[PDB]
Design a protein around this ligand. Sequence first.
Ligand SMILES: *[C@@H]1O[C@H](CO)[C@@H](O[C@@H]2O[C@H](CO)[C@@H](O)[C@H](O)[C@H]2NC(C)=O)[C@H](O)[C@H]1NC(C)=O
Ligand SMILES: *[C@@H]1O[C@H](CO)[C@@H](O[C@@H]2O[C@H](CO)[C@@H](O)[C@H](O)[C@H]2NC(C)=O)[C@H](O)[C@H]1NC(C)=O
Ligand SMILES: *[C@@H]1O[C@H](CO)[C@@H](O[C@@H]2O[C@H](CO)[C@@H](O)[C@H](O)[C@H]2NC(C)=O)[C@H](O)[C@H]1NC(C)=O
Ligand SMILES: *[C@@H]1O[C@H](CO)[C@@H](O[C@@H]2O[C@H](CO)[C@@H](O)[C@H](O)[C@H]2NC(C)=O)[C@H](O)[C@H]1NC(C)=O
Ligand SMILES: *[C@@H]1O[C@H](CO)[C@@H](O[C@@H]2O[C@H](CO)[C@@H](O)[C@H](O)[C@H]2NC(C)=O)[C@H](O)[C@H]1NC(C)=O
Ligand SMILES: CCCCCc1cc(O)c2c(c1)OC(C)(C)[C@@H]1CCC(C)=C[C@@H]21
Ligand SMILES: CCCCCc1cc(O)c2c(c1)OC(C)(C)[C@@H]1CCC(C)=C[C@@H]21
Ligand SMILES: CCCCCc1cc(O)c2c(c1)OC(C)(C)[C@@H]1CCC(C)=C[C@@H]21
Ligand SMILES: CCCCCc1cc(O)c2c(c1)OC(C)(C)[C@@H]1CCC(C)=C[C@@H]21
Ligand SMILES: CCCCCc1cc(O)c2c(c1)OC(C)(C)[C@@H]1CCC(C)=C[C@@H]21
Lengths: 344, 344, 344, 344, 344
Amino acid sequence: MPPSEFLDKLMGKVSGYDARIRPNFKGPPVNVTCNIFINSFGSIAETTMDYRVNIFLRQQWNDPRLAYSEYPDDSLDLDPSMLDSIWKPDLFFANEKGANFHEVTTDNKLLRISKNGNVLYSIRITLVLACPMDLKNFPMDVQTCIMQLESFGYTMNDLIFEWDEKGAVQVADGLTLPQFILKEEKDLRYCTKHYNTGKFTCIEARFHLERQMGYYLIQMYIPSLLIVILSWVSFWINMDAAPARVGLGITTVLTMTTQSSGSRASLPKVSYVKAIDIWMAVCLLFVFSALLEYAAVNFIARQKLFISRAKRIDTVSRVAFPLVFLIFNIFYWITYKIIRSEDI
Amino acid sequence: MPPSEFLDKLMGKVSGYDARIRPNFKGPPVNVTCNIFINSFGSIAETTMDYRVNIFLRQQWNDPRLAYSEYPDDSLDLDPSMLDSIWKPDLFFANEKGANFHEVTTDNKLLRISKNGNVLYSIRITLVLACPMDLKNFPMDVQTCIMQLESFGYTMNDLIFEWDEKGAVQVADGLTLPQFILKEEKDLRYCTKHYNTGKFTCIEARFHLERQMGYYLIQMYIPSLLIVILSWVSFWINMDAAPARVGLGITTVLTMTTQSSGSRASLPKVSYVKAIDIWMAVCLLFVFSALLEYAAVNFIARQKLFISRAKRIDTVSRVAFPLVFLIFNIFYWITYKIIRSEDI
Amino acid sequence: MPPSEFLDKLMGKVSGYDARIRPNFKGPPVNVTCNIFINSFGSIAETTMDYRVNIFLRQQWNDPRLAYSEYPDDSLDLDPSMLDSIWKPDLFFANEKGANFHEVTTDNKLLRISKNGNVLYSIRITLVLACPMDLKNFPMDVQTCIMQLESFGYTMNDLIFEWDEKGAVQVADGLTLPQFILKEEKDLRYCTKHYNTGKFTCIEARFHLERQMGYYLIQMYIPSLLIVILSWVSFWINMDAAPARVGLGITTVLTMTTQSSGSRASLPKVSYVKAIDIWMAVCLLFVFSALLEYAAVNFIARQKLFISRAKRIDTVSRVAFPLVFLIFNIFYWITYKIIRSEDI
Amino acid sequence: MPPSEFLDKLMGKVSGYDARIRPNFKGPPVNVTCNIFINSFGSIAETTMDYRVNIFLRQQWNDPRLAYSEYPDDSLDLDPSMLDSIWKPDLFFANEKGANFHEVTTDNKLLRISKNGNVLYSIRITLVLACPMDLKNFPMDVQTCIMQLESFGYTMNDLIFEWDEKGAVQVADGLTLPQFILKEEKDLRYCTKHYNTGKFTCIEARFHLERQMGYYLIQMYIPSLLIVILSWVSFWINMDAAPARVGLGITTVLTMTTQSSGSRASLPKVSYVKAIDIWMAVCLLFVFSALLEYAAVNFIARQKLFISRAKRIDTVSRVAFPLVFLIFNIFYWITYKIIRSEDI
Amino acid sequence: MPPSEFLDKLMGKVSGYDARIRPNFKGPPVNVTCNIFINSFGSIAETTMDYRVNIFLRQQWNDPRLAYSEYPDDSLDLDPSMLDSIWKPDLFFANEKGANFHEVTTDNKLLRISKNGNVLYSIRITLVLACPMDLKNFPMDVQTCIMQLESFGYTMNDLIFEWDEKGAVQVADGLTLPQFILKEEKDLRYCTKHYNTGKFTCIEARFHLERQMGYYLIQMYIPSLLIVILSWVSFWINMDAAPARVGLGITTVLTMTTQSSGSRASLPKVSYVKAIDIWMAVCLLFVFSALLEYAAVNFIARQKLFISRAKRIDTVSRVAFPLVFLIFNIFYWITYKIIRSEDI
Ligand SMILES: *[C@@H]1O[C@H](CO)[C@@H](O[C@@H]2O[C@H](CO)[C@@H](O)[C@H](O)[C@H]2NC(C)=O)[C@H](O)[C@H]1NC(C)=O
Ligand SMILES: *[C@@H]1O[C@H](CO)[C@@H](O[C@@H]2O[C@H](CO)[C@@H](O)[C@H](O)[C@H]2NC(C)=O)[C@H](O)[C@H]1NC(C)=O
Ligand SMILES: *[C@@H]1O[C@H](CO)[C@@H](O[C@@H]2O[C@H](CO)[C@@H](O)[C@H](O)[C@H]2NC(C)=O)[C@H](O)[C@H]1NC(C)=O
Ligand SMILES: *[C@@H]1O[C@H](CO)[C@@H](O[C@@H]2O[C@H](CO)[C@@H](O)[C@H](O)[C@H]2NC(C)=O)[C@H](O)[C@H]1NC(C)=O
Ligand SMILES: *[C@@H]1O[C@H](CO)[C@@H](O[C@@H]2O[C@H](CO)[C@@H](O)[C@H](O)[C@H]2NC(C)=O)[C@H](O)[C@H]1NC(C)=O
Ligand SMILES: CCCCCc1cc(O)c2c(c1)OC(C)(C)[C@@H]1CCC(C)=C[C@@H]21
Ligand SMILES: CCCCCc1cc(O)c2c(c1)OC(C)(C)[C@@H]1CCC(C)=C[C@@H]21
Ligand SMILES: CCCCCc1cc(O)c2c(c1)OC(C)(C)[C@@H]1CCC(C)=C[C@@H]21
Ligand SMILES: CCCCCc1cc(O)c2c(c1)OC(C)(C)[C@@H]1CCC(C)=C[C@@H]21
Ligand SMILES: CCCCCc1cc(O)c2c(c1)OC(C)(C)[C@@H]1CCC(C)=C[C@@H]21
């Protein structure tokens, strides 16, 4: 007979199936297997603190009833329009800004009922998940994107869902994300929302993102360093050349001020301090201190002992400033590597 | 018997329940308990003057009728699709740009009816609430976000709602807001909209936000200060070096003009004066005044008394300018601390 | 009897009410009283030329029929879902980019029917109204926002609507608009759209906005002025200092070019000239002319008469340039004040 | 009798009107008169290549049937909700990114049926039309916006539509567009989409836009010119002043590099060359060539014949560079005026 | 008889057509011909990694049943509203961010049934397709846009679709894309999604985009080159002019730092290195090295042999630096041309 009408027979008014009643009512909890496939991952935004994913949610659960066992066909495909008839678990996302279904040509929803009573339900969804992130160490940060599936109004005694045994989370290859790189650990855990009403089920899949330092290393870090090196040539310039040294020193100060001012527009718009800010502030200190010594030495030589003292101060700061800059660099880089390692 | 049909019996045409009639009609006012849980708080925008929240609205009210008292089950869960049947209070938000419900998989709406007649109604909502804010003192400002729930068309004699006794407003931990920090006071009050028709009920929960000065202190405030210090070295430079002093002074003026020009792009786009604007204007004054004195002293020495007078002017402005800058700094910081303390 | 069913009796098929037929058909025009309350005003955008408002539209009109006169209740509240039953005037907005209703929890629509037959209809709407604006004088401009309500397909003989006698337009206090200030005149007028088909009714409420000059005065106007003052110190610098004067003059030219280049990013993106553009162009002229004279005087003194002539040219331009700048400033400010006064 | 029911009689099941069948089936083509009124024109975006319009589409066509000829009323107004009943021509827009109807209070749709059988159908629509545009000559470009109405699935033998005889396209006064100016020619033409299936009807109204050169002339063009003039003063400066000339020349090069760098942010983000780019490149050449000659002359005089040769080179390039710049300016402006004239 | 009712006869309950059953059930696979017409291509966004297209999807398939063969008309046009009746293949797009239908006036859907049983189905769709792209070589990159059509839930034994024999993909002329140029190869291939359930059909059309180097060549590449040339004039400047050389060298360093800082705002916001970044870093090296040699030579001459050695170093670096810059340029350009050729 026509396959669709057989389904009508199964879920129709004649037979006592009420879509509003959980399978195994007043009984053992319904177990739901969950499989997630990520088509596209991207659009991470630091300001609004959300990223966008397109996924293929796949729930598997067993229904005691709705087992026909008298048909040649081994499975039945329900029409996507009349999806109200089957009881579907109310699975939502705890950290959801907004999500909607797809209607490109037909509903991207597939439901298949096996002979024994297994139900396979697949839904293609696009989601704006909200993940808290921080930029304490902005060039070298490892953010974690948390995706959590939780029930709405059903307790542990009623509905339980957990991850599939193998291949629970899969990702289509070649994401080519603009800033971060998606790692392949994809660790899975459990959450149990303990509320006043009772325990609620939750499962959680998190993803690790590691930010690439290509543009960050080549721009900002390398030019600042070079400008500090060019700041130190004033030491090697003879003391008598007052216009040449004053002009060079102030111009280098202007140069770094322009570099920082230009780079902040590219940088994220946050209010707490970051690592790049510390680096820029330290470079401003180095250029500023190098100008100050020139004005601290020229005063000394106009008022032959003073000449000797001035040249001594020149040579001392000549070998002092690179070595102190090296000590700063070693400590700064070591500290950030240790802190990122601690994070991971 | 099947739980759903029992509900049908209760709210069906057979029994006289009209969803359009308030419980306790022509009687004492219906009291509605209100609980709010904030999943996510963020996306504060100074231009459009709105912020976005995702909440879990939870209304509790007592209905005299709809009390079954003849069933084993202690509570009944109504289907979210057929929510028209129950009478729901028309609670809206007075300051709403836009809001919509969630349909991730199923309706994020739960309604539960107790044995006695208590109704528990939970709705997950995302809201764009509008809060007036001001930036009279932009780096150190404390804005208040006002969330107010008001009735639509029901008077105090008909419908009254107030906050829950304990845990009325709850916030999920780890917001990690980009600029502000959410405080934990969360004070609650009442409003009564007195109109021509009559008094209308309203309850109001406000949140205090304190802006972090990390990036604001490290960038702009610290470099400007350093550039003013480098402006004062021209005093210590000998008078005879006309190219060195003129070049240094104008270059410092250029340097601050570039810093202010770069920083305004990062700053908010408002038309009234702020605190950072006062600081930048004052620094421009300091660099400008320091150039002016050099051109006021060089004229004096070309026309031995004049030489003495010139060197006197040099030494006087040498000890004058830092001390006056210190007096300005003390007054500026003290005034802003007092005004922010007054605000809080 | 139940209040709702009484309404059913009134507007049901049994009685001859056809919602598609105007009250007083083939008769005197229906008069509609209109009241507007502005919850929020903001999001003025110069590029797309639209602003966003949230309002409380309140239409009052009298219906000859639908007068019950046999009930204890003095008014009847119709269910918002079944609003098709009553005849509602088709009032639209002539300058509408986009508008939509609110569904925060329930429909924000209230309709109340009095005993005599008065109908009170209240709708909360958010609107993107389009108002033409211009920036001929950008820092000192007074734009007018025009809100106009017009009928759609009904002539003057059929439907007429006008403003309420008192309190026709009300605004909630504390808008805190980022750039403009909303004035309180709120003048009301009439329009009659004379078309080929006939006269159509329209009423119009306009709002006056005055742009604050805080940030505009403190930034751009004040630094440019100071840079022009620093440009004139080259006159007081001795002629013999060729590196000092050439360096100072070109550096000041660079300084203003940087200020204008930075400020244009903040400024609106329009193609016609404004006032700030005239001010920046004039300042560029002043710096350019001051460099030109230095190169016009140095040539004169290398080829003792020439020395005297050169020093004469120096002193003449020394007292010339400030006074001419003052004459420009007086004319520019006076002209803009007169033109803005003419506008208002 | 009630006017609405008369319409029911006309289009009801009793009478044989099938809304799915074209008027004059198996007969002469239906002729549709088309009238367009533009409420608002704006939001031209060069990146996405689309502009937004709000229009009043007005189709007039004659229906042989649906002529009552037995009623006092001379016209009948159909309810906007039940618009499925009448047969409406399937007119779409060939170059449409997105469009939607308006629901401000009621449907902005009016349909009126005359006594003889003329049908007047008016729809208010907002449209995002896509028009290809180019910026070969960006400051002086004349873009054309093409609006084309075409049938969907109906051939010339079935459905033909053309423009109204007089006042086919009308525009509400005072657009105040930010960059372009809308011209009043508004020329109308025909298109016939010849496909594999057959000829399809189309009518096309295009609009001419002329870009204002106010801000473009005052900023960028005028300062660059002035900086080139200030570059040439180095020629008049004496050869012996090596710091003054080298400093001035390089500073002018820096000045133009800053102006171009600042202005590109304001300019459109396209990849092909424009006119402003040619102007900036040419100015960079002029400043660069003027620095090169100074370094080409100073070498000559250190190695009395060489002194004479150097001063000769100075005077020659002194009168050479302005005149060559003038020749460039004349050719550049003449070429752009000719090309824009060719376009129009 | 009326054409529509004949269709009703064909697909009505009386005849056994169940829209939920595939044509040729339990039989040979249904073959679907696919034709795509691109109205508009644009809005390529590097950040979110998606582009927007407006297309005319045209599916052709043969249905054994639904062949009337007793009517004068050679084809039947089904009403777009009642499209549920016919069985439509569930064709979706594998890489879809979001897509929706058009409702400008009527549904942009046409279905025509031939006499034999061929079904022609045309749908106008706007799509946000997601294509991975990379910017390893940003000025000279060739990205590929992949459009793939795949079935949802139907295996190869059930449903197969492939491209039309001729004119499978067509593009309307005159795209005028802002950055890329669309090529005309438009190569077609197959994909077969091998899953756990079975093989699924897919067809794939890709488009080649070549980025124009107009603005990229004229701006950034040409000025940097010129600034490096102006950096080398310091070699030709005499050694004794310490203020002139130091001032020129540092000013050129400042000039390039400003150019790079300004240009990054225009450039895409990605984290990995690009080609333009390498070019800017190399130019910073050239200016930095040229300053370093001046400070490496001046030290040598203050401590007649040293004078000779200094002048030797000057001449050596004078002929060294251009030639090394030439070697770099040749290698850089050759490498990028080879890599782009490899890509294509
Ligand atoms: C879902 O899985 C849970 C896992 O705990 C099952 O619960 C256990 O079932 C076994 C088998 O009957 C019992 O031995 C345990 O006592 C159960 N534990 C609890 C805590 O109930 C549950 O049976 C599964 N659901 C179904 C429908 O089989
Ligand atoms: C809702 O709470 C209000 C609080 O005022 C209750 O009103 C009071 O009820 C008590 C108990 O009967 C009376 O003694 C007071 O006279 C009431 N005050 C007023 C102003 O009416 C009200 O009864 C509560 N609602 C319900 C349904 O119990
Ligand atoms: C709506 O107001 C108009 C105002 O013009 C009323 O029209 C006038 O009504 C008075 C009172 O009967 C007459 O004396 C005038 O001749 C009317 N003027 C016109 C131009 O018709 C109108 O009656 C009001 N509508 C209703 C329903 O009362
Ligand atoms: C629509 O206009 C067309 C214009 O071509 C009309 O077609 C012509 O009608 C006249 C009058 O009967 C004939 O003399 C011509 O032979 C027709 N030309 C063609 C090409 O058919 C058409 O009749 C008009 N439609 C209606 C319904 O009158
Ligand atoms: C769709 O095309 C496929 C192409 O493979 C057809 O399948 C072949 O049909 C021919 C003709 O009967 C047979 O000789 C082959 O054995 C078939 N191959 C396979 C793999 O089945 C198929 O018949 C076409 N569909 C229809 C409805 O004709
Ligand atoms: C090595 C034995 C005596 C050293 C005296 C000495 C000299 C000196 O010039 C400085 C010293 C210490 O400390 C540091 C921290 C390096 C300073 C950096 C800031 C500036 C302005 C000066 C530096
Ligand atoms: C202390 C006894 C006499 C002081 C004379 C004196 C000298 C002086 O140079 C100034 C004085 C006062 O006032 C202040 C406000 C500090 C001025 C700041 C602005 C400039 C251009 C000059 C400053
Ligand atoms: C007062 C009696 C004779 C005055 C001669 C005189 C001298 C002079 O230097 C100028 C004069 C007029 O006109 C103005 C408009 C002020 C000019 C501004 C532009 C420049 C380059 C030069 C200015
Ligand atoms: C007029 C008789 C001989 C002229 C010799 C001559 C000299 C000269 O300096 C130049 C000449 C031609 O050609 C132009 C194109 C103007 C050049 C512009 C670029 C630079 C660096 C030099 C210019
Ligand atoms: C040709 C025979 C001996 C050459 C000695 C020599 C001299 C010299 O100045 C340089 C040399 C090599 O290597 C290159 C890579 C060109 C250097 C570029 C970086 C700087 C600071 C110096 C350059």
